[PDB]
């Protein structure tokens, strides 16, 4: 996260760290959506241009974390993956369309002060909140600039108008993506960056005061560049797939 701040304790208790077993290192962010399901970006798991293709046994999930590097005794919980599910129309060849994947945990995780799931939006919440100018929050342990934090970083970013999203890049953008960030004239800045991939873009509904995950950190050209924006997987647009998987693999 570029130009963010340290998180408060328990501020994002759905934040998940995707961790590589050997060599031990951060791979990506993710989110907790129930006691056994974690949501992430497909590109975290499968990206053939970079020879990336991880299997269940290559990884672990670390939940309830604050510190990036520290092993957070009596607080974080480490979970093994039972099964990875990637969107069958994930477009790794071109633009990361449908950049989404589910991970099923071997055992249920125990909820605590620091571990708690985020909600996924219904159609009406998405229609009400995904408006240009409305702000969400993105969280992660990735880089602080484009060429590492001690603790989880947080940044609030406004949703950008689709024409501005489109005109900021040569990449083909789809209805399964949205972009967020400040315009050059807006002064303020911030963005996701490398290692923030797969982490949640959340909004707090003013109707029921619950946090909803509207997006997944997906792609960006550079990090926190003027005139560029971060792109997010549109979770509501892929919800039908999410429910099929969960409805199918319990």
């Amino acid at each position: 996260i570029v130009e963010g701040s340290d998180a408060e304790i328990g501020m994002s208790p759905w934040q998940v760290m995707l961790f590589r077993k050997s060599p031990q290192e951060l791979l990506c962010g993710a989110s907790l959506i129930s006691d056994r399901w974690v949501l992430t970006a497909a590109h975290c798991l499968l990206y053939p241009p970079w020879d990336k293709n991880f299997t269940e046994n290559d990884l672990l999930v670390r939940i309830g974390k604050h510190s990036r590097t520290r092993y957070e005794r009596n607080i974080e919980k480490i979970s093994m993956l039972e099964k990875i599910y990637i969107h069958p129309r994930y477009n790794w060849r071109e633009n990361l369309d449908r950049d989404i994947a589910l991970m099923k945990l071997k055992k249920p995780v125990a909820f605590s002060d620091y571990i708690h799931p985020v909600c996924l939006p219904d159609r009406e919440t998405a229609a009400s909140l995904l408006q240009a100018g409305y702000k969400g929050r993105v969280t992660g342990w990735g880089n602080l600039k484009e060429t590492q934090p001690s603790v989880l970083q947080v940044v609030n970013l406004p949703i950008v108008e689709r024409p501005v999203c489109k005109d900021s890049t040569r990449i083909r953008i789809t209805d399964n993506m949205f972009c967020a960030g400040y315009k050059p004239d807006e002064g303020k800045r911030g963005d996701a960056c490398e290692g923030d991939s797969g982490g949640p873009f959340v909004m707090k509904s003013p109707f029921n005061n619950r946090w909803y995950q509207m997006g997944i950190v997906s792609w960006g050209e550079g990090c926190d560049r003027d005139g560029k924006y971060g792109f997010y997987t549109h979770v509501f647009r892929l919800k039908k797939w999410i429910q099929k998987v969960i409805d199918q693999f319990g």
């Binding site: 501020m11 708690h116 909600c119 409305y134 707090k204 619950r210």
Partner: peptide
């Protein structure tokens, strides 16, 4: 779940975090 999106250290205790109001103010 039934309790999703309600943080134990914040919404469940009726405590606000330091910047959540910036989001609310944007929801116009």
């Amino acid at each position: 779940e039934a309790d999703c999106g309600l943080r134990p250290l914040f919404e469940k205790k009726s405590l606000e975090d330091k910047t959540e109001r910036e989001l609310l103010e944007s929801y116009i």
